Amino acid sequence: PFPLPTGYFGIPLGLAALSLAWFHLENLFPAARMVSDVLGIVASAVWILFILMYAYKLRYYFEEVRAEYHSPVRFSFIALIPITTMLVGDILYRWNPLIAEVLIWIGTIGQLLFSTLRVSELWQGGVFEQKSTHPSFYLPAVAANFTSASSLALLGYHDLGYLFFGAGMIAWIIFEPVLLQHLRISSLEPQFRATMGIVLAPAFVCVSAYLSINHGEVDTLAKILWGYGFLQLFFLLRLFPWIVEKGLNIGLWAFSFGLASMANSATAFYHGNVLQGVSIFAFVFSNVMIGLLVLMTIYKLTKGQFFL
Amino acid sequence: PFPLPTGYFGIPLGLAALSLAWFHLENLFPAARMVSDVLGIVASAVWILFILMYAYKLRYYFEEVRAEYHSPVRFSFIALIPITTMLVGDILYRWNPLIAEVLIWIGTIGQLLFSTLRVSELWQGGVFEQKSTHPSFYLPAVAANFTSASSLALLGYHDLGYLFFGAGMIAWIIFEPVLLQHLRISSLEPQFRATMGIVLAPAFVCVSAYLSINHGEVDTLAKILWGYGFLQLFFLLRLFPWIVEKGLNIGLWAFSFGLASMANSATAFYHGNVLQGVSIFAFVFSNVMIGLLVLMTIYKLTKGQFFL
Amino acid sequence: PFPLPTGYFGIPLGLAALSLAWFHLENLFPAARMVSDVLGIVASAVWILFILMYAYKLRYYFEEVRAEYHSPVRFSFIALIPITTMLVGDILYRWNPLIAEVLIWIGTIGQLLFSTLRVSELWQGGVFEQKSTHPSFYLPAVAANFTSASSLALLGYHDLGYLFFGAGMIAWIIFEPVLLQHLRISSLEPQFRATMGIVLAPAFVCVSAYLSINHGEVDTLAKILWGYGFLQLFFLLRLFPWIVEKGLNIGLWAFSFGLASMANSATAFYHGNVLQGVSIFAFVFSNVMIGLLVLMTIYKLTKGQFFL
Secondary structure, three states: OOOOHHHHHHHHHHHHHHHHHOOOOOOOOOOHHHHHHHHHHHHHHHHHHOHHHHHHHHHHHHHHHHHHHHOOOHHHHHHHHHHHHHHHHHHHHOOOOHHHHHHHHHHHHHHHHOOOOOOHHHOOOOOOOOOOOOOHHHHHHHHHHHHHHHHHHHHHHHHHHHHHHHHHHHHHHHHHHHHHHHHHHOOOOOHHHHHHHHHHHHHHHHHHHHHHOOOOOOOHHHHHHHHHHHHHHHHHHHHHHHHHHHHOOOHHHHHHHHHHHHHHHHHHHHHOOOHHHHHHHHHHHHHHHHHHHHHHHHHHHHHHOOOO | OOOHHHHHHHHHHHHHHHHHHHHHOOOOOOOOOHHHHEEEEEEHHHEEEEHHHHHHHHHOOHHHHHHHHHHHOOOOHHHHHHHHHHHHHHHOOOOOOHHHHHHHHHHHHHHHHHHHHHHHHHHHHOOOOOHOHHHHHHHHHHHHHHHHHHHHHHHHHHHHHHHHHHHHHHHHHHHHHHHHHHHHHHHHOOOHHHHHHHHHHHHHHHHHHHHHHOOOOOOOHHHHHHHHHHHHHHHHHHHHHHHOOOOHHHHHHHHHHHHHHHHHHHHHHEEEOOOOHHHHHHHHHHHHHHHHHHHHHHEHHHEEOOOO | OOOOHHHHHHHHHHHHHHHHHOOOOOOOOOOOHHHHHHHHHHHHHHHHHHOOOEEHHHHOOHHHHHHHOOOOHHHHHHHHHHHHHHHHHHOOOOOOOOHHHHHHHHHHHHHHHHHHHHHHHHHOOOOOHHHOOHHHHHHHHHHHHHHHHHHHHOOOHHHHHHHHHHHHHHHHHOOOOOOOHHHHHHHOOOHHHHHHHHHHHHHHHHHHHHHHHOOOOOOOOHHHHHHHHHHHHHHHHHHHHHOOOOOHHHHHHHHHOOOOHHHHHHHHHOOOOOOOOHHHHHHHHHHHHHHHOOOOOOOOHOOOOOOO
């Protein structure tokens, strides 16, 4: 088997999202820029390492790549590649705008092409089963579009960012009903439970993208999106003992994207002098949770329980 | 069996919502305040009586309480307690702001805790079944959040009201698809048919909460929400002979919350000089329907067919 | 077997929608008015012919009419009559406002009554099956409401137009989740595949109606709706070889309404100096595709493969 699962890209993804969240606090906190730089450098290094490993997988393990691509449930994790590329481009935009733009456009084209080729192929039917409605399906249809929207808005194409953000938002509102119904009805196998953290992602990722597109102006839509995001956060907080029933694992990084988007939208809200205490608590909670995830990952690396 | 079903709290709920709807007409009609006071006093008295009965149930009939709480379909009716508490607090806010604030906060905390503890356990799966997707599921996930949003906005916490309103709105949009699909596919047993009136609730409750949060400004969102609410109202009007196929019962109070929210949003629309004729018709229709419900309830009390 | 299927009304519907799309370009081009006039006259003539055919069907083949109406899947195509009536009224509004208003009101009342009588009757259940969740269900619940909203906004009743637009939009958001889940799970049979083009309709029809109601002001909602519409457009472009797996047929006119709404919203966007290149490409693509559909229909008529 391939040592690095395609789902391990959540590590650089979460680190990059938290790096941007810290970057948003440059003016208010002098060491915020240094913390963001450290997080972004670590995320970029990890992403480069994982991209080299995945290129090796394509060169020598193409059978596994095709098996995961054609699998109706495991294909969604391939969307973590363009998302992480877009986030790393967002990070590099603070230093070298040209390479940042190149990475952002490569990631946008890659994720859009992947969604067009695969997510649309499911409509043929037969391969997608009622038991394949997993939270990981958000990544190609929802998370990728939101990340592309935010990245493009960062480059100055707000209208295109609005298009991508709307695609992501409506895809999320269109897929979540069936996902939650399946979770209520068919439960979820213990191995796939850790991916439930992605249910926290779309609500906060959407508001983060919206605040990035419209210059961080806190509309009514941003407040509504936080309302739903915090409802989902409470639901998943009550369920965490059930999610980790079989013990902690690297699969808990699925919460990383949601927590980092929560932190970013929290900085956006605090800048706007709206719900300041809630924003501070959300930022602290997300940072502490991602720090615990980092500590757990380092522990797993030390004990060798990281790679497969 | 306990003489008072948990679903009988719709009586004080509907009466309180209609009381607030009338209250919103303080300046236009001199007798609106008197009518609102009478309705609110009756609703508060009935709510106090029912709360005493439910405390008795907890003290002596805790097995039934545990059975309904753990039931995947009957748990949603326990959410009528905090909703009625918040509505009674809204009523009392006209007389005793401190007691009203206390009741509103108790109701908000109670409903949020109930949704966190129960509506999220369903995601574990195995207890919720495709035949348990009933209209009553709106109460803990949708109606409670909207009522908390409106109550908080009445206290002055608009941003928190916006958060709760968004939670409720997105929960409604996420749950209605599967609910309507189940209704189309699996029908609904005659005993649970009267609860179909809750399908009317979310569309009008959402617009009522929105108009309460934003100072009763008739935005485009309010018009859209009335569009959907009136579509659902026509759908349920065409189905009423089917809903009461087995005869009228106290379960028809499920329409009470929807009709009262329709009346409240109608007052809000009329104040804003938007669709005055439609607003007048909606207000009259809601008042007449709730009056018919009150007459039916009084007749059942006289006949002795009210308590179980 | 009546020669003209009820689903052939998409021809006058698509032609009329494209006629309005061209009509929106009077001032920019000199020949736009002439092209719109030609398209509208052809659409009106075809609609009159089809309405005479359907009146003949009702007078002599009422059994087929009653069979399609009571069929849970074939009933949705009866909604093409009021939709095409409203579109033809929109066309005639440029020449004779009184007859245009009469046609728009007749179509609005007809579609609303049909949705109330039939779409609501499904909630009784037992006739609608999980395999009856076809894309054609958009027509009575979604497309009709949007067309009524746009036509009413043309007459000057913006608030009523907003009500109808909101009804249609929320109905679309509430139905699409289960429709897409059904498409993913169970393959659409080859004969029903051509109707997949209706999946492209709601996203663009919604934005067209929104831009018509609000005087063609490109709002954030319009950009979001284009985002989703273009996502669906790419999904269906990737699937087209599968949709026509068994050969081209008149059922491909299902794409006509979506493409015409695309063209209309493209004119609206270009007028507003928003994404001019994307708008031009969308307009050209929609016009070319509808022209190809027209050529295919002409060839089928020449070969005698049009009527049943």
